[PDB]
Every structure is written in C-alpha cells, then in structure tokens.
Amino acid sequence: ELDQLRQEAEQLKNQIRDARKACADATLSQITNNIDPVGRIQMRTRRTLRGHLAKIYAMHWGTDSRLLVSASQDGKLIIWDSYTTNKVHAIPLRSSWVMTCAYAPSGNYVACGGLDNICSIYNLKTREGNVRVSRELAGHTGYLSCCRFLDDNQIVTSSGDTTCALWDIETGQQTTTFTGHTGDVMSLSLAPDTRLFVSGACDASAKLWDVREGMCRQTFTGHESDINAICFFPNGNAFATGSDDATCRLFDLRADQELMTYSHDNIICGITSVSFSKSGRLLLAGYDDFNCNVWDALKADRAGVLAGHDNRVSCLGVTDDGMAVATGSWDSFLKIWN
Amino acid sequence: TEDQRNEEKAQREANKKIEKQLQKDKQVYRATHRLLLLGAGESGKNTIVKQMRITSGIFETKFQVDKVNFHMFDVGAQRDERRKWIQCFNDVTAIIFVVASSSYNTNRLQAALKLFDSIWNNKWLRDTSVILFLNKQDLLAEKVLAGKSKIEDYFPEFARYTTPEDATPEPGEDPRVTRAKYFIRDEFLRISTASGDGRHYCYPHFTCSVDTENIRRVFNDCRDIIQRMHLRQYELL
C-alpha cells in the first residue's frame, strides 16, 4: 500500500501543479511593469542600540511603535525605547540560548524562547513594577524558533520539533498543535486579522494554518532550501519567505503559488529575516552577507541597501505604522533606519 | 511640558540602572567561557557530563578550573538536524566534539567524521575551535588488540597508514593500539588541517569516559585557543 501511497501523492501533487499552472495566466512582474519603480531610497542608521553582550538573534517591534524587544543569547532580553534609545527593561533569561522574542500587542507581556524548548512569558506591568516570569510553555520537544502573540492570552509558537503550537497562556497548555511540516519550523507570521499564520520549516515549503480550525489550509513549495523568515504582506492576502537559497519569494493565499522571486546573481548567501513596509511596496530582507537589501515588492529590483551592520543580520522588523525599520545583527547592535 | 521632561528623567535613571546591571553582566559574561558539548548519542559524552557534574532542550554543566568559570552546554532533546541550532554556538570558546573512536561497526565513526566535517566547514563555525575528545580509547584498545574487526575493512587507507614519528603513546600500549589511535586522530585531522586558514584550530585528545584529566584537557584547550586567537590578532600567528 505504501507504493500506492507514493503514486497517489505524486499524482495529487501533479494535479495541484496543473491547477496552479492554469491560474498562472500572467505573472506579477509583467503586470507590474508599467508601475513607476520606487527608484533609489537611501535609509541611514538613525539609532544604534548598544548594550547586548552576545549576538542578537531575534527582535519584534511593539504595536505602539515606541518600545521594542530584542533577544541576545547572553541570557538577556532587553526592551528598548526607540525614540530615546533608553532601555525600558533588561530581563535576565533563565536560558542563555534564546532564539525568539515577542512583544504582546497590548504590551503587558513579552515572550521568548530558544534551545531550552520553553517559551517563557514575562509580565512587564506587574503591580510590583518588576518584570517576572508569568508562564513557562515547556510542551515543545524542540528549540523555539519563533513566537508571536495573538493576544494577552494566546501565543503561537514554533519549535525545532517541526510543529507549531497554539498556547493558552493562562492555563499554559497547548490549545492546538500544528503538524505537517517535515523540517524544523523557523519563522512565524500572524495575519493582520490574527486568524491565519504561515511558517517555513527547513523543507523549502511554506504552510498556511488556521488558528481556530487548526489544520493545514494551504502549502507552498517555491523555495529551494530552508526557509528562515516569513512575513505576511500588509493586506494579509500574501506573504514573503526568505530562504537559504539566497532568494525571497512572494506567495498569495488565493493564487496558491509563487507570485515572484527577489534575487540577484551577486547574492549567494542565505536569508535570515524578511518584512514588509506598511504599504507592502518594499520587501526588507536581512541577508547573511552582512547587509540588508530593500526589494521592490512589485518591480523585482533592489530599492536600497542597509550596509551598516558588521555581522550576520538575524532579525528585521518594520513598525506597524511604518515610520522606521530596525535591523538586528550578530554584532550585538540594533540599528533603526528611516 | 514639565511632565514629559520628568518622565524622560525617570527613563534616564532607569536606563542608567540598566547600564550598571549590563556592565556587571558583561564583566561576568566575558569571564565565563561557553563550551558546546557535541557527539554521537552512543558516545561517552553523557559519562563525561556525569564526571564533570560530580526534559529541557539544553543542559547546563557549570564547573571551575583554577577559579576559571566554564559553562559547558549539552544539547539534549534536540532533533539530529543540527544545521540550524548549531549556528547559535559560533561564539563559544570551544566545541567539545566527543567521538567514540571504537564505534566503528553502523559505522558511527564515519558518521562522527562527517559531523566534524560539517562543524568545521560550517560558515558560522569557522571562528570556533573544536576540542576533539577521541573517547572510548580503552574500548578501541580492547577491540584492536584482541579482535578480528579489522579497521582497514572500514578504512582502506588504514593498511597504508603508519604511526608518525612524533607520536607520544602511553608507555605500555601495543603498537597496533597506538597505530589505530593516531590513524583515527589524523583522519579527524583531514578536516581541521585541510582549511589551513588558521582562523580556528582543532585539539585532538585521546580520552576515556571516566578520565578526571578531561576537565584539565578542556582548561588547557581553552588556554591554547585564547592564546592562539590573541597571537593571530597580534600577527604572531
């Protein structure tokens, strides 16, 4: 029966490929050819956040666009005031090897995790005024790669165990487990409505997940190597993924296929982070080649370059209002560009 | 806006306190040497952890040598797809690669050699030295001294290999045991010496799972790694 299973899966994949080909009447690049390109935009380092001891690996902007949380593997999780550079909080982590951080939309809680396989929740606004561990989510069997708050009580977490999990913070139990990814899940992105999220899992495939239904709604396999970064297009109908193949690819939840690819011959290194501007015209992706390329989401060209970082870029995030984009790096410095 | 400036002053005070705390943490961190313990599951790395200590995805073993803080990390409960979580250990002082030299048949020795090749050739680990603990030396001695499990069957170049004149075997070991030991060592040197960049160095060590010197071996390896890094910075290497 296993051979019949292989044959059936192969012909199902062929059918889906044919269906995607049928919808491919015209590519995004050709349709967007007539639009005026963004041209050349030169974003410069506006704020340099210093204080992290080890290399920074994750970051997340707050909804207020003022406070931001960053994670470095020195056992410290610093919250920075973007406007003044003042560190609002400096949370010592029980596990040094933190790989993810998340700032709650209301800002009352912060989550982080890593090789400890625990997504620790930190309460920033305890009545005593101190920051203390609120809940420890230890049900994952692998390193936490990414985490994102749906709300003060719901957090989606990705783990090295190749499965994503939806956690109820108050009870600290897996409300729903997302299985289907063959490889290690690296990045998470919550949709604007918080009803859908996508992730790439080291299998060159991106999967669409239903937060409430808890099932794999769609799968995308445009990439050639491990996907390290994923982010929805600001409208929530599409998302871009960064992969070790040195290319970014845009996928639409309705077309169910790769709309376009962002790449150039000189870039051979892997991709660590990807994010969209508020309008979604600019795709900002962090690269292993020590700089970040600004990609025109429509015209398929590099609109700009952020070459201020001295080490690998690990994380990249744009403020919800789009005022500025902050790029983290392995040099232990966060640079805010605008 | 007097209230805004008062809030700014309070934030500045909090920032200064956080700067003091981060300076203390930096002083502690730079004085602490992180070590990644890695190797085959069937290897003796767990026994070495037990000697040094005498559900989580990573285990912290803290030990002191000559009042020097060492934070050895054992990566347990993690899937064997190491290419991602291994990248987190680029800044560790050394990677303690524990290989059971006697685990040649699956041929776990060849798997360990491939894992060492990946570790050495990884882009982000090119700055990290590897402490190669050639563990299970007694098992290898027993296997080769009074066993027909010929090494050259699983390593044909072994029949052509000869013990280097620079070898310093333990007095009493049979010539075959020393030959196999140094053959395995040089096979691991295939990767370490092939790069030739001098950016990071490998420190093979013939070790047994219960040797107390292993801690001293790690201490000496860290000394050598730091000294070589400083010398290369000073153009002396």
């Epitope: 060159a204 050639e224 190597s225 | 798997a111 894992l115």
Partner: nanobody
Framework: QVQLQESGGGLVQPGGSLRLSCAAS????????MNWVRQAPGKGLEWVSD????????SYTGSVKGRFTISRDNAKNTLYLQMNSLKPEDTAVYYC?????????????????????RGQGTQVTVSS
Amino acid sequence: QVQLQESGGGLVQPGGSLRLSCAASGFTFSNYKMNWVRQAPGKGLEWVSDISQSGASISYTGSVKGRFTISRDNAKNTLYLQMNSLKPEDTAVYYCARCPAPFTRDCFDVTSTTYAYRGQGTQVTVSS
C-alpha cells in the same frame, strides 16, 4: 518543489555492478553539494559518498572507497552512483540526499529524522 527520484535497483548477484540514478528537479542542481546515503534493514542511515558542486571533489566511505563511483551531470540535473563488485552487506535502500544550503561544502543530511531534501530511495538487494 524540491524533488529527488532515485531509479535503478532490485535484485543483483554479489560481485556485479549496478548503476543508480537520481533525477533532480525544483532547484539549481549545480549549486548544491550532492551525496548518497543508505539505510540497510535494521541499521541507521549511513553516508555513502558525496560530490561537490562542480564535481572536482569526491569522497567515499571506507567500506566503499575504490568500489563505487559517484558522478553528476549538471546539464540534465542528474546524479549517479556506479556500483561495482557489490557485497551482501551493501543491501540497503539508497536515498539520494542533497545538502541543505547551496554554495556551501557544509552538509547535514545524514539526519535520522525525516530529511526534506532526500528522495524516496531505491531498494538495492544483494543475494546469492
């Protein structure tokens, strides 16, 4: 979609030859280091041989050195493993495995857990 389809295999007498093939698709074949791994009945996955991107560098496991020949042809996105003088111990399912990232000689595809960039595998059986 990353696809690796091994072809060739089946019963073969000891001491014979067997030319395995691997049709690659969905990625730039030349940009990734390729290698062969096998899983004999009851034993774990074992690395057999690897070939660099350009094919100028090749390595074989000691039990395979001088017995099997690994070759690749980037012109048709295919990888080969020319097996000669097969032994009974060689009986195993040979999985055509690709290394994770391109342009890097690093490789982490001997993982026991399900590896995404290895093919279904072709059964190779050696019997008298």
